[PDB]
Amino acid sequence: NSYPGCPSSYDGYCLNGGVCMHIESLDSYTCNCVIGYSGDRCQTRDLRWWELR
């Protein structure tokens, strides 16, 4: 499941320019970036159309 969360236990999980979101798949926290950036946060500073509709 997906859940909006991102404590200060990490450290700007999202960098470059991305939002922070908590996951329920394993109670893990992820992040979302934008074109030229994505993955676990914004590490994947690449393209790869990662969007639908």
Curated annotation (Swiss-Prot):
Residues 2-43 form the EGF-like domain. It comes from the Eukaryota. Residues 48-53 are annotated as: Not required for full biological activity. Disulfide bonds join 6-20, 14-31, 33-42. This is Epidermal growth factor. It comes from Mus musculus. The lineage of its organism: Eukaryota, Metazoa, Chordata, Craniata, Vertebrata. The gene is Egf. The chain holds residues 977 to 1029 of 1217 of the full protein.
